[PDB]
Design a protein around this ligand. Structure first.
Ligand SMILES: Nc1ncnc2c1ncn2[C@@H]1O[C@H](COP(=O)(O)OP(=O)(O)OP(=O)(O)O)[C@@H](O)[C@H]1O
Ligand SMILES: [Mg+2]
Lengths: 76, 176, 70, 441, 30, 32, 140, 290
C-alpha cells in the first residue's frame, strides 16, 4: 500500500484510516500501508495501491465540490 | 446619522445669507427668539436650547423614489446629458430652408441640388432621432446588467485592481 | 420551395416550354415563377396536390407569361 | 400674523425654482431646522435635492447647511457625502467653529473621506490652543465617527481636556467619540466627568454619556443616572434604549432610572414592534437582563427573541479572523479537557457547538450534567484600542446575558491568547479561564 | 425599459475595459 | 392604487435578488 | 505515464443547447462561445431502433433541389447516399438540403420542423469555417 | 417567507424589500410566534456557498440603489460612490476590500511552494500589467540562482526576488513600504498611527481610482451605445426597442410559478403605476402616501 497524507500521522489517525482502507482490499488481505507526506492535499488521505487509487483527500473534495456547483448552477 | 447628536442653539446660524428669506434670532440665556419671513409670510416661534436637541430623536431618513432604480436613473440621466451635447451641435446647423426658393433651384447644378435636398433630409433624420427621449430609458437598461454583474463579485463589491495590487504586495513581500 | 418546383416541371411537361429555345429555358423559368400569380403557389402548398379546379386555373396562368426567345 | 404653513409653502416655492443657489438652500434648511418640520419629508427632500445640485459654496452657507442637516435629524448619505467637495475645497477658508461643524456633520452621517479627516486632524493639531474645547469635541466626534482611528487627535484632545474646564455637552460629545474610538483612557474620562457637576441641560447628552461609559465600562456616576431618571421624556426610544444599555453595562442598579427609561421604550414597541432596530432590541434585552428591571409581557419575550437574533446575525457575519480565533480557542478547549489526537479535537469541537435556549448558536458550549461553562473569544473588534487592551463593555454585556440563561462564561481574549507559544500553553490558559469561573469542570 | 436578469458572479478582478470613443461628433461635424 | 407608500416605492425594481434567490433555493438542498 | 479510467463509455452532450454551435469530434465546442448551456450527455454508440420501434417513411423531406425532389425524392427517416466523384456537387446538394429546412421551418408549425446536423469529417478547418459563415448569413 | 438564514443577513441590510421582510418577521415574532432553530450544520463548503449566495441577495438591491457618479466634476462624488459600495459590502457581510482580497490570496495559495505557482494561481486577482512585471522579475532572479525561487521568506533566494519585486511595486505607483508597515503594525500607537494615516491616504487613492475607472468605463459604454443609437432612424429604434421589450416580457410570462417572474411582472406593473401617477400630477411627482 501507500497512504500519502498532508501532515504526518499520529496514533489515532493511523488506526482510523487503516480501518477505512481495509474496506478497499478484496479479501481478508493484510494491508501493508506505507506513509508519505504531501501538503498539496489539505487533509484527508490518498491511497496508492499501484493498481488503483482511492483519493479521499479534501483538496479533491473541494475540486469535485466546485465542479458540481459550476455544473448545477448552469442547469438551473 | 448616529443615535446621539450634539448640535443646536450653540454656534448656530444667527443670520441668513440670502436675499430671499429673512432670519434673525435672539439667542438669550436660556432660549431663542426666532422670527423668520420669506416673502409674503411671517413666522415667529419660540425654541429652547433643549427643543432642538429633541429634533434629531426620530430621523427623517430620505430616500429616492425612482421609476426603475437609482442606478438606472443615474445612467439615464447621463444618457440625457449626452443627448444634450449632441442636440447642442444639431442646434448649430445652418438654415437650409433659406435656400428652398426657386432662385436657388434653377441657378444650381442638378446634382448639387439633389445633394442639398439629401442634406436637408439627413438633418431631419438626425433631429428626429436625437429627440427620441423615450428611448434613453431602454438604452440605460443595456449598461445596467453588465455593471451589476461586475459588482456582484466573489471578493467584494468595491474591489478594483489597485487595492488588489496593494494587497498583493502586502501578501507577497511579507513572509510566505 | 416545393410549389415553385412543381409548377416549373408542370410547365415543362405540359408542353408550355416547347418552342422556347434551349439556351434560355434556364432563363424562361424565372418568368414562369415570377409572372405566374403568387397566390396560385399558396393553393398548391395548402392542397399539396393539383386539384381539378387548379390545373384549369394554372394552365390558364401559364399562358399569360412573356417567355424569352419564343 | 403667525402662519407657519404659509412660510413652509413659500420656502417650498423657494427651492422649487430652477436656478436656486447655495445660499437660498442653506437659509431654507436653517429655516426648516428652526421651525421643527419633521412631519413634512418632501420639503426636506427638495432642500436636499437642491443642496446636492448647487455648485458654488462659501464657508457660511456650507456650515449653515450642515448644521441644519445635523440638527434637523435629516439623513441622505449621497447628498451629505457629496458635500465633502465643498468641505475639502474650503478647509483653510473655514473658521475654527466652521471647521468644527463641518467635520461634525460629515462624521456623524458616516462619510468616508480620509482626505477630509486627515486635513482636519492636521488643522486641529496645528492650531490646538486656538480652538474652543467644544470645537475639539466636535472634530473628535467627526473623526471618530468617520472611521478614522486617530490616536494623535485623541491624545491632543485629552491634553486639552486635562487642561481646560469643559461643558457638559462638550464632555458628553467627547465621551461618545472616545467610546466610538474605544479608548477608555482614564486620564481623559475622569477629567471629562468633572463637567457633569452643573447638571446636564439636554438628556440626550446624559444618555450619550451613559452609553459611552457603558461601552467603555467605567462607572455609574449618579450625576448622570438621576439626570436620566429625571428627564426621560427628552429621549427617543432608540436613544433611551442606549441610555439603559450603557447604564446596565457600567454597573448601575437604580431600578427607578430603568423604570423611567423603559417607560419611554415600551409604548413604542406596543406602538410599533418594528420601529426599532434589532440591535436596539438586543440592547433592550441586555439592559432588562443586567439591571433586572421588568418589561411588559409582550415586550420581554420579544426582546428575548431579538437578542438571539442579533447575536446569531453577528455570528453569521463573523470577521473571519474571529472565526479562526474561535476555531483556535475551541481546539484549546478540546486539548484542555483531554484530547491529544486530531480526530479527538475534531470531534470535540464538532460537539461544543450546541445551541442556545433562545434559538441562537453558541460556538463553545460545554455541558457536564447541569453546570454549563461557555467559552467566549474576544478578537480585537471588542477589545479596547489602547495598551492595557481590556475587552469592551459589550463583552461583559454578552457575558451577563449568557450568565442569566445557565452559563458561566469564560472570556478568552485574543490579546493574551495569540501571544502564547503553542497549543499546550493555550490549553492550560483556557482551562485556567474555565476554572476561574466554575471549577466543577 | 427593462433588462434581462442574470445570476452569475464575477470571479476575476480585472480592468473595467474602457470602450472606444465613437466618431459621432466628428461625423456630425462633417 | 393611488398613493402606494414610501417603503413600497423605495425598492429597486429589476434587480436580480430572486433569480439569485431561486438559484440559492434550488442549489443548497441539492448540494447538501 | 499514468492512465486513469473514467468509468464511462464515450458520450457527447446532446440537447437543444447544441443548436447553433460548432463542436469537435466529441461534443466540445470549437467556435469560441463558451460551454454548451442547456445540454445533457449521452452515449455515442446507441443501438438503433428495432422493427417494432419504427413506422413507414411517409412524410417528404424537401431538399429544395428539383433534380432530387422530382426524380429521387426523399422521405423523413430515409437515408440517402450522395455519391460522386472528386469535385461534383456533393456538398452543394447537402448544403442546399440544410438551407432549405430554414426556409421551411419559418412556414411549418413547430412540430414538423427539421433540425439539421452537418458532420464534417476529415475536411479543412477553413472549409468548415466557410460553411459556418454561409449558415450564419443565411440563418440556417 | 424567509428561512432565518435569509433574515439574519437582512438585519443589517437597509434596502427596501429586505427591511419589509425583516419587519414582517418581527411583527410575526411579537404576535406569539417562536423563532426556529439555527442550523449548526452544513460543513465549511456549504457554509461558504450559503454566505456567497446570501451576500449577493444583499448586494443586488444595494448595487441598484447606488447612483453612479457619471459625468461629474471632482473626486467627491467618486468618493461618495466608493463609500456607498464599501457600506454595502459591510452590510452584506464582507470585510474591508483589503482584508477580503488578502483572504482570497491566502485561500488560493495554501498549497504554494514556489513563487511561480503564487504568481500563476493568483493571476485572476492581480492585474496583467503587474503580474507580467512580477513574472519577468521572478525570471530575472531565476536566471541568477538557476534553482526554483521558493515561497519561504527566510530563504534569501526568495529575498533576492522580493527586493526587486518591491522595486516593481514602487514603480507601479503604489507605496509598498507603508502598506507592509500597516499590516505589520507597531508596538506604540503614536508611531503606528502616523503610518496608518499614510496607508489610508494610499487606500483612498486606490479605491477612488478603482471607482473612477469603473465610472469612466460606464461613461464610455453609455456614449458608445448612444452614438450607435443616434445613427439609426426612429422607426428602427422604436421597433428594435419594442421587439426587445416584447421578447423580455414573454420570457417572464412563459415563466409561471417562479418567484422572480411574479416579482418581474409586479415591478412592470409598478413602473406603469409610476407613469400613470406622474401623468396625474406632473408638477408634484408620484403620489406618496406619507
Ligand atoms: N448546382 C451547382 N451549380 C453551380 N455550381 C455548383 C453547383 N454545385 C456545385 N457547384 C460548384 O462546384 C464546386 C464543387 O462543389 P462541392 O464543394 O459540392 O464539391 P464536392 O462534391 O463537395 O467535392 P469536395 O468534397 O472535394 O469539395 C463548388 O465550387 C461549387 O461552386
Ligand atoms: Mg465537399
Amino acid at each position: 500500500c501507500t497512504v500519502i497524507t498532508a501532515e504526518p500521522l499520529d496514533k489515532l489517525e493511523r488506526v482510523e484510516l487503516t480501518k477505512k482502507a481495509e474496506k478497499f482490499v478484496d479479501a481478508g488481505f493484510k494491508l501493508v500501508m506505507q506513509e508519505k507526506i504531501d501538503k498539496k492535499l489539505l487533509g484527508g488521505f490518498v491511497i496508492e495501491f499501484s493498481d488503483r487509487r482511492v483519493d479521499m483527500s479534501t483538496a479533491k473534495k473541494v475540486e469535485e465540490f466546485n465542479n458540481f456547483v459550476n455544473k448545477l448552477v448552469l442547469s438551473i | 446619522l448616529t443615535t446621539f447628536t450634539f448640535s443646536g442653539l450653540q454656534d448656530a446660524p444667527v443670520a441668513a445669507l440670502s436675499g430671499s428669506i429673512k432670519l434673525n434670532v435672539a439667542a438669550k440665556a436660556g432660549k431663542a427668539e426666532v422670527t423668520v419671513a420669506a416673502g409674503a409670510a411671517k413666522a415667529a416661534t419660540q425654541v429652547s436650547a433643549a427643543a432642538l436637541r429633541k429634533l434629531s430623536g426620530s430621523k427623517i431618513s430620505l430616500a429616492e423614489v425612482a421609476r426603475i432604480s437609482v442606478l438606472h436613473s443615474s445612467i439615464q440621466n447621463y444618457l440625457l446629458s449626452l443627448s444634450n451635447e449632441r442636440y447642442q451641435l444639431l442646434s448649430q446647423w445652418p438654415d437650409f430652408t433659406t435656400m428652398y426658393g426657386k432662385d436657388f433651384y434653377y441657378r444650381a447644378h442638378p446634382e448639387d441640388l439633389k445633394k442639398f435636398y439629401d442634406a436637408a433630409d439627413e438633418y431631419y433624420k438626425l433631429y428626429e432621432t436625437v429627440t427620441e427621449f423615450d428611448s434613453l430609458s431602454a438604452l440605460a437598461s443595456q449598461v445596467v446588467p453588465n455593471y451589476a454583474a461586475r459588482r456582484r463579485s466573489t471578493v467584494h463589491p468595491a474591489i478594483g485592481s489597485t487595492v488588489a495590487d496593494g494587497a498583493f504586495t502586502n501578501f507577497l513581500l511579507s513572509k510566505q | 420551395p416545393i410549389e415553385r418546383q412543381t409548377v416549373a416541371v408542370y410547365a415543362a411537361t405540359k408542353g408550355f416550354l416547347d418552342k422556347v429555345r434551349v439556351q434560355d429555358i434556364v432563363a424562361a423559368e424565372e418568368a414562369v415563377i415570377s409572372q405566374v400569380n403568387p397566390a396560385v403557389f399558396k393553393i398548391l402548398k395548402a392542397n399539396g396536390k393539383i386539384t381539378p379546379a387548379l390545373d384549369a386555373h394554372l394552365k390558364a396562368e401559364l399562358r399569360k407569361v412573356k417567355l424569352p426567345g419564343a | 400674523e403667525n402662519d407657519v404653513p404659509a412660510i413652509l409653502k413659500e420656502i417650498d416655492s423657494l427651492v422649487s425654482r430652477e436656478a436656486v443657489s447655495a445660499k437660498e438652500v442653506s437659509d431654507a434648511a436653517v429655516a426648516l431646522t428652526y421651525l421643527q418640520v419633521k412631519a413634512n419629508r418632501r420639503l426636506w427632500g427638495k432642500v436636499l435635492e437642491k443642496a446636492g445640485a448647487a455648485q458654488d459654496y462659501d464657508a457660511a452657507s456650507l456650515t449653515n447647511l450642515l448644521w441644519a442637516i445635523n440638527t434637523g435629524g435629516v439623513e441622505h448619505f449621497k447628498t451629505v457625502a457629496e458635500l465633502a467637495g465643498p468641505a475639502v475645497s474650503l478647509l483653510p477658508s473655514l473658521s475654527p467653529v466652521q471647521l468644527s461643524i463641518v467635520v461634525e456633520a460629515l462624521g456623524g452621517a458616516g462619510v468616508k473621506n480620509y482626505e477630509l479627516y486627515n486635513k482636519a486632524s492636521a488643522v486641529v493639531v496645528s492650531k490646538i490652543g486656538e480652538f474652543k474645547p467644544a470645537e475639539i469635541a466636535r472634530v473628535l466626534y467627526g473623526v471618530a465617527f468617520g472611521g478614522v482611528n486617530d490616536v494623535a487627535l485623541a491624545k491632543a484632545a485629552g491634553k486639552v481636556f486635562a487642561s481646560t474646564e469643559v461643558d457638559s455637552r462638550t464632555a458628553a460629545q467627547a465621551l461618545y467619540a472616545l467610546a466610538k474610538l474605544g479608548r477608555a483612557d482614564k486620564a481623559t474620562v475622569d477629567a471629562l466627568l468633572k463637567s457633569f457637576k452643573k447638571g446636564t441641560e439636554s438628556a440626550s447628552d446624559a444618555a450619550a454619556a451613559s452609553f459611552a461609559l457603558g461601552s467603555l465600562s467605567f462607572k455609574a456616576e449618579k450625576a448622570i443616572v438621576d439626570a436620566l431618571k429625571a428627564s426621560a421624556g427628552d429621549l427617543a426610544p432608540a436613544q433611551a434604549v442606549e441610555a439603559a444599555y450603557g447604564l446596565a453595562l457600567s454597573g448601575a442598579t437604580d431600578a427607578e432610572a430603568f423604570k423611567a427609561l423603559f417607560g419611554v421604550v415600551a409604548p413604542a414597541i406596543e406602538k410599533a414592534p418594528d420601529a426599532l432596530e434589532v440591535s436596539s432590541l438586543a440592547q433592550l434585552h441586555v439592559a432588562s437582563t443586567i439591571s433586572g428591571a421588568k418589561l411588559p409581557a409582550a415586550v420581554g419575550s420579544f426582546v428575548a427573541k431579538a437578542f438571539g437574533l442579533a447575536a446569531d446575525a453577528a455570528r453569521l457575519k463573523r470577521s473571519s479572523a474571529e472565526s479562526a480565533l474561535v476555531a483556535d480557542v475551541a481546539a484549546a478547549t478540546a486539548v484542555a479537557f483531554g484530547a491529544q489526537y486530531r480526530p479527538e479535537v475534531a470531534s470535540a469541537v464538532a460537539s461544543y457547538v450546541k445551541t442556545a435556549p433562545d434559538g441562537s448558536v453558541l460556538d463553545i458550549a460545554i455541558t457536564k450534567g447541569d453546570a454549563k461553562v461557555l467559552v467566549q473569544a474576544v478578537p480585537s473588534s471588542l477589545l479596547t484600542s489602547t495598551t492595557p487592551a481590556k475587552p469592551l463593555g459589550h463583552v461583559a454585556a454578552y457575558s451577563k446575558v449568557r450568565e442569566a440563561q445557565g452559563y458561566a462564561v469564560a472570556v478568552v481574549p485574543a490579546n493574551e491568547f495569540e501571544a502564547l507559544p503553542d497549543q499546550k500553553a493555550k490549553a492550560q490558559y483556557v482551562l485556567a479561564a474555565i476554572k476561574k469561573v466554575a471549577p466543577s469542570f | 425599459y427593462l433588462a434581462p436578469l442574470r445570476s452569475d458572479f464575477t470571479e476575476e478582478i480585472t480592468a473595467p475595459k474602457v470602450a472606444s470613443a465613437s466618431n459621432l461628433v466628428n461625423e456630425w461635424n462633417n | 392604487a393611488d398613493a402606494k407608500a414610501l417603503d413600497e416605492l423605495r425598492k429597486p425594481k429589476f434587480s436580480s435578488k430572486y433569480l439569485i434567490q431561486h438559484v440559492s433555493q434550488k442549489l443548497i438542498p441539492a448540494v447538501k | 505515464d499514468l492512465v486513469y479510467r473514467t468509468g464511462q463509455i464515450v458520450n457527447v452532450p446532446i440537447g437543444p443547447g447544441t443548436l447553433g454551435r460548432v463542436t469537435d469530434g466529441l461534443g466540445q465546442p470549437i467556435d469560441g462561445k463558451g460551454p454548451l448551456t442547456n445540454v445533457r450527455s449521452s452515449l455515442v454508440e446507441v443501438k438503433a431502433p428495432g422493427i417494432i420501434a419504427r413506422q413507414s417513411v411517409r412524410e417528404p423531406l424537401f431538399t429544395g433541389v428539383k433534380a432530387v425532389d422530382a426524380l429521387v425524392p426523399i422521405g423523413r427517416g430515409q437515408r440517402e447516399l450522395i455519391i460522386g466523384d472528386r469535385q461534383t456537387g456533393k456538398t452543394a446538394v447537402a448544403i442546399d438540403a440544410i438551407i432549405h429546412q430554414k426556409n421551411c421551418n419559418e412556414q411549418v408549425p413547430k412540430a414538423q420542423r427539421v433540425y439539421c446536423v452537418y458532420v464534417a469529417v476529415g475536411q479543412k478547418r477553413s472549409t468548415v469555417a466557410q460553411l459556418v459563415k454561409l449558415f450564419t448569413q443565411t440563418g440556417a | 417567507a424567509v428561512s432565518k438564514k435569509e433574515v439574519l443577513y437582512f438585519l443589517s441590510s437597509k434596502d427596501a424589500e429586505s427591511s419589509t421582510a425583516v419587519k414582517s418577521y418581527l411583527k410575526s415574532l411579537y404576535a406569539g410566534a417562536q423563532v426556529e432553530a439555527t442550523e449548526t450544520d452544513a460543513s465549511e463548503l456549504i457554509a461558504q456557498l450559503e454566505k456567497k449566495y446570501l451576500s449577493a441577495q444583499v448586494v443586488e438591491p444595494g448595487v441598484h440603489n447606488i447612483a453612479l457618479p457619471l459625468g461629474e466634476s471632482g473626486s467627491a462624488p467618486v468618493k461618495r460612490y466608493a463609500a456607498e459600495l464599501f457600506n454595502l459590502g459591510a452590510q452584506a457581510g464582507f470585510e474591508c476590500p483589503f482584508i477580503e482580497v488578502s483572504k482570497k490570496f491566502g485561500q488560493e495559495t495554501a498549497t504554494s511552494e514556489t513563487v511561480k505557482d503564487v504568481l500563476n494561481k493568483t493571476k485572476s486577482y492581480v492585474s496583467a500589467d503587474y503580474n507580467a512585471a512580477l513574472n519577468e522579475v521572478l525570471s530575472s532572479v531565476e536566471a541568477e540562482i538557476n534553482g526554483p525561487v521558493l515561497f519561504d521568506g527566510k530563504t534569501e533566494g526568495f529575498k533576492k526576488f522580493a527586493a526587486k519585486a518591491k522595486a516593481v511595486a514602487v514603480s507601479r505607483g503604489l507605496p509598498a513600504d507603508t502598506i507592509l508597515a500597516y499590516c505589520a503594525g507597531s508596538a506604540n500607537e503614536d508611531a503606528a498611527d502616523k503610518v496608518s494615516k499614510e496607508f489610508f491616504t494610499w487606500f483612498e487613492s486606490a479605491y477612488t481610482a478603482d471607482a473612477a475607472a469603473e465610472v469612466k468605463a460606464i461613461e464610455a459604454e453609455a456614449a458608445s451605445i448612444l452614438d450607435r443609437h443616434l445613427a439609426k432612424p426612429v422607426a428602427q429604434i422604436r421597433k428594435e426597442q419594442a421587439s426587445a421589450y416584447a421578447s423580455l416580457l414573454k420570457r417572464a410570462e412563459t415563466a409561471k410559478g417562479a418567484k422572480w417572474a411574479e416579482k418581474y411582472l409586479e415591478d412592470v406593473k409598478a413602473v406603469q403605476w409610476f407613469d400613470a401617477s406622474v401623468a396625474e400630477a406632473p408638477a408634484s411627482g408620484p403620489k406618496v402616501a406619507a
